[PDB]
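As proposed in the renewal application, we extended the modelling pipeline to accept nucleic acid strands and small-molecule ligands alongside protein chains. Below is a test complex run through the extended pipeline.
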Amino acid sequence: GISRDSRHKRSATGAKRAQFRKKRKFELGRQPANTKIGAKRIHSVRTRGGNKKYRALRIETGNFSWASEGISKKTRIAGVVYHPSNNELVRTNTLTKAAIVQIDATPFRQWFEAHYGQTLRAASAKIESSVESQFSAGRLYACISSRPGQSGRCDGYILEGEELAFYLRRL
Amino acid sequence: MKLNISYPVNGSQKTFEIDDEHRIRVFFDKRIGQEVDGEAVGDEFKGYVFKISGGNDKQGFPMKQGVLLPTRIKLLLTKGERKRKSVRGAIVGPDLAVLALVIVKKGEQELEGLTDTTVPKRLGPKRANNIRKFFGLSKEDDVRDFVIRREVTKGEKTYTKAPKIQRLVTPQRLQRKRHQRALKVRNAQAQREAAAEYAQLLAKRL
Amino acid sequence: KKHLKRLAAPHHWLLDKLSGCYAPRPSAGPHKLRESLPLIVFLRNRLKYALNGREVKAILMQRHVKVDGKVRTDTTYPAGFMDVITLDATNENFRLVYDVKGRFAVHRITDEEASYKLGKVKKVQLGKKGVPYVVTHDGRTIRYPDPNIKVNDTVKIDLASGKITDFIKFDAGKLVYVTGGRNLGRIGTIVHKERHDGGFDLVHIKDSLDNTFVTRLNNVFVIGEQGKPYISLP
Amino acid sequence: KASKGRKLNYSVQDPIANYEAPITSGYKWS
Amino acid sequence: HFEDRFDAREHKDRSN
Amino acid sequence: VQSERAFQKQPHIFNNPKVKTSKRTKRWYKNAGLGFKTPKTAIEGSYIDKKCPFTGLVSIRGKILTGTVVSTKMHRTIVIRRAYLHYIPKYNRYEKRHKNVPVHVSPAFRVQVGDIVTVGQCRPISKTVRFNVVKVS
Amino acid sequence: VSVYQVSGTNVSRSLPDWIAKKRKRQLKNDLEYQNRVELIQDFEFSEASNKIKVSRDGQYCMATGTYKPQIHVYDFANLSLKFDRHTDAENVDFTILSDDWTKSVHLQNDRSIQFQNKGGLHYTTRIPKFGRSLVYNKVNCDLYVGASGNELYRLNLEKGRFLNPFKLDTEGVNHVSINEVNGLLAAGTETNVVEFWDPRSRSRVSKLYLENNIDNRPFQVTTTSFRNDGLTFACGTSNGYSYIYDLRTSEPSIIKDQGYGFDIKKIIWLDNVGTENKIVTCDKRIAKIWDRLDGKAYASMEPSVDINDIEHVPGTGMFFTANESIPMHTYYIPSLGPSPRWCSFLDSITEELEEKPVYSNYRFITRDDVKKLNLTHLVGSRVLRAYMHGFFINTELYDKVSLIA
Amino acid sequence: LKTLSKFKNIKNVYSATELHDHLMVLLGSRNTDVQKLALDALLAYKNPTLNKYRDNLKNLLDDTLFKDEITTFLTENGSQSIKAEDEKVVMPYVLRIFFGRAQVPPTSGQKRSRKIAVISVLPNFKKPYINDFLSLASERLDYNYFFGNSHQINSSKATLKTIRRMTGFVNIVNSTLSVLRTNFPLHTNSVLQPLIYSIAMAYYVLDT
RNA sequence: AUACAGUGAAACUGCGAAGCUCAUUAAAUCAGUUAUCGUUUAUUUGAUAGUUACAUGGUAUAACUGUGGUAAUUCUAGAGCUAAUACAUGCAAUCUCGACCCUUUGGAAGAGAUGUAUUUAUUAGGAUGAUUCAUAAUAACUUUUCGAAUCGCAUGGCCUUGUGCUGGCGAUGGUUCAUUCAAAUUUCUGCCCUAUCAACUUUCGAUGGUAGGAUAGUGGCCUACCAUGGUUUCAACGGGUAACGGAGAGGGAGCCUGAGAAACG
Ligand SMILES: [Mg+2]
Ligand SMILES: [Mg+2]
Ligand SMILES: [Mg+2]
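Having received these inputs, the pipeline returned the following structure for the whole assembly:
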């Protein structure tokens, strides 16, 4: 029933167009995939051509990258905290791109301790105070940079700097 | 109802029409996959164990496993395409025209048409390892000498036919593998040579 | 679609319209459909070697025809501009070039001329593993090109090895052949390249008779320097 | 604002008109 | 704007 | 700059807080070409605009038009008006016609009602916008 | 008491179901697979099931799906899927107006209400704001829809017009329920208060502020249900407590908690089965049957996977539960009542079934809650029992402790 | 081995302890098929703590579920982690199982990633347990005679087989150092002296 | 032809299945044209992958044998076989810096380096007017892809006589890129009368921005928030038309295959 055709819309002038033809399969849309935290469950979709799309119907773990330290670790997702588009998505714990989620800090903490030999040379180990506080809490704010409804992945990056300050203000 | 009893060890199968209702009643209310004692099914069947495997009703509709009813229902089956077809339940009842049974165990007395007779296998092994397993051949022994042959007599002409072995090791397969490896190596050599030639061309340009 | 009406067939084939209900449909290949000559047309309606399609099929299945040094058995193989067609049984080599009328002309050539062709450098780019390559007009991807080769240049390809023997830069005073527009088939020398960024660049071409004409860059094919074409012209 | 149904429109909707008929008996209690 | 497209009719003879 | 629910940033442009090499945030920009000068306010500006021809992910290609700005009141887009004379052969006379084109305008340009603007075509930005304001005058 | 799982996932929560099926084909030789009994063919959604309901006729069932968002209608007589109908968006809730499956109203998550008829989607309408619940009055022919906004939107099916929406004092309505005998209606606000409205007039009869002397933390009214008698009312608090109220009084007769700390989703009064004083309360984790008057746990239904909703066939012992797993679990409790007519011989095969089994009776404390409650001393003693991350505790003792702390 | 698992009471066999120890070695075998048979016989021994985590150990052996089981079962502060009281009994089984996976050659990307996963779970372990894993890698190597004498290599020990066992051990240590880094536990017996003795053998073979 | 070898029913695999009848619509159809730096593309054409094995399993059945039910179908159940390009599994090398400057092509101690595919993060950046484009690298991720367990013809070159080593011409396969065949959107232009058709659009998006969902992708195509806009007396909008001068296969609704279909299945 979903279609991406522009014929149903009113013209630029505002005239009401008539149905030129029945809906075609080369202008189809598919139902949205409301990804939610839980046991991983991905549904394959056969698209135009031989290409396939992965529907992250449920997902709980993802590869998040620490940009400042230039590393990446696989971490569990605790829950959605803030989503810029719609707040009901935050209410229902829906995962999509640009969503701000809370992730476990255990792997990043272990890596930092191993690499710098310092509980969380001294100058290099220094990091932003808010990020230090988030590690002290035990969970980190991250922004998902992937599209779970398309690629079946929920990778992302830990917020830092002005980005983190802005989203803390919004929270 | 008729009872189609099969002995799979021998490969035999035979039908027995039962007229009295008592055998039919002791069969009632069971399920496909359950087992019954032949002694109830008859003195001739004394000591036998019969596993119910299926059957057909007076209207010809078969029984299906997994459906739990005494009556017929229209179920959505597949011969991806699925069609709605009538099938009778897995609960044996008085509406069954024929009930199929498999002899799990043999009783004291021998059935005339099932235990006493045998039916040989139709075909023999065709893959090499299958033949080795069948004859327990050692690795050094060649399967070529152990291939089963069937004799065919057309009129006065007579000859032996044997299956074409598959997955067998032959010189041709080794030649193909060697050719593939040599082709890959040659392609790599050509690529390296072209890269070197480009390198000296750039060296001359510089 | 899979059927072509003769009236809908390309003009440049020189086919007579009333010969039949249908014309051959050039299969996919190096050259575009509207810019190709299927082998059946070349063998039957131009060279008159075969009298019908079945005769052409017999000839091809005999493996007597080579295109760019490779045997082709497809009746509708789309041979095109600057494609070398060899008939070894008769010992002939032909090169396809448009006429001033705009139609393909069957030009016989020597063996040495047949040994090589020219390709217009449509693209120069680096492939995987950092290996530079050039894509020509006939769909040939040639690896490890000379660095000086750039787009709109012309590379002399050896058919046997498929390697660039030499190259010609695109510059004023160079001898060019028109492969599009109303000037299709004309030969001249470049005078100036008028440059419109984000638009079709324009080249002015002067003939030996001093007459000048303007054509889009995409339709230009450098074939040599003035007075020294690298191929035998008809 | 009115577009996308964000504001409530109280005009009659023909397809759902007379979809169901009320029960005249009423609630069991008086 | 300019088309720069070949036209068969112009080159084809119309003497008849 | 951050007057929206989401944070505005140039995608894949990373400012490493740890290094702190420079005070100014790293800014990516490109010259749209056709010999057209990219303004310095775009080079040294702070706005974020995905549809800006010099800083956004939009490339100018195709037709280049000129027109008179008639409206500028929508956010980052304007309505220009191109006037022409349509020829009627039967009366052998011209009649005044005009066509109104909506065009995206980057914040790097300041456009009023009446000035002449040169615009360039790009990929479809919105329902009716297929161009981008690129020179004001 | 004994609980028999007729169908569902027999594997543990950690084991993924889809690989198990790919291992299931490998072990198809194992005899138990051939002898399995499936009550209803294709009783499994593609990924998960959101809601399940049984038609009042008693011969049909309906369910909603995840991907592609689709509606499954099952026929008990044929023990199979009558049809599947896809949708444009996932279903938040729905109801079956007719006694049969013919007429049903569906509330999608895209802010749109869809009316489904025999042939197909009869009509679709959009409400002003996102919805969370749905209910319909037979007497008034008025469909009552909660939403994120404070208003509780009112649609009249007889006149086919939206009407004046009831204005809740609080913002948001998590759940709405209507009592058949009374007509009284309740709404579950995000704050710990239930606002009762009258449908005869357009008024707020009163509001009840849920009081939790045990836990002082905030919570929301997630579910509300009215008993058939009409003088009893049940609530579901997000903290994980379900309250039973007699509407005449203003105090909770009994407060029973599941203990895991998850929200209450569905509350069902098992009046029809016999021994009317039994109630069901359903978390994501577990669903428990306990006595109405005394609050003693009768039996427990714990699936491996989360529960999205539970439904009970009237007059019978079976319970259908919508779960996150590919199959939809269904449980039979022979003690409560006889099996339904359609699956008559399910009673004959009770021995073959799984016969799955303490969690329902006792409360569960998190490690942080243990430290706050000053129960670190209880740790390592018989009183406190460890269950994985947190430790179980007696219900009465926990109530006394939270009063202390 | 399959017969050993089917024994009704493996604990009361003639030599249970010596058998049981060898079953640990088989649990450390590279071939996952051997490990499953070894684990079943180990499960035939009745041990409540091992019984509690029977599914997780089986999932570890299964290749398809190996990755997810590591993330859920072994991660520190995750729910499904082993309880502290049960660490002592279970971790010896865990180390032997993971060692077998480390033994698996990295001939394709999947085994290369599987090798990385096996070494990446070490930080979740406590420091004594990490040292135990390193001890297992060096148990096969024979170095005590070298340090026992005045640092002389035996000609018999100088073989291609020993060098390969050297190469496996060194590769394990190099990966472990990269993961643990400054946190790595260094002990003379477990790591340092097997490491040094490998260097001496390399010099011995290269010169000789 | 003592594995088979010619021909070959049946069956499993592989490829391809993409005229009529009604309605009608003013540059929304259509013709010409631009762009795809905004996309998918079976096939053709050119390039392109050194990272138990003298060949694994039924985790396998059809065709086939045999026993039956039914009034009965391109209706059927029970029992027993057997194969693959079907289904699963899977395996002692090269290149740099190069001391010694030993010999001055040269050898060479030592030190190094070494797939592809998806997603995210980061670092560098020959082609085009223009790019975050091409390409390379680092850290990880993946229901981690692929990297010949295939077939025909021929039987050459060597020797270390073992059927030891090494091989010629094709077919069928396979990753990526380009080309071709196409498809989808898209820029601009294009002869009726019309005001006795002056307002139309937000009429469940009308005009634009941010973010997200979906698509093969751009995009109000759809959704949340925000601004109140857009067309028009230079004729918007509406009406009439010798605008034959777009729809469906008993009627509406839903779904499935493929490179291409909302399929005359
Ligand atoms: Mg009859
Ligand atoms: Mg190819
Ligand atoms: Mg967007």
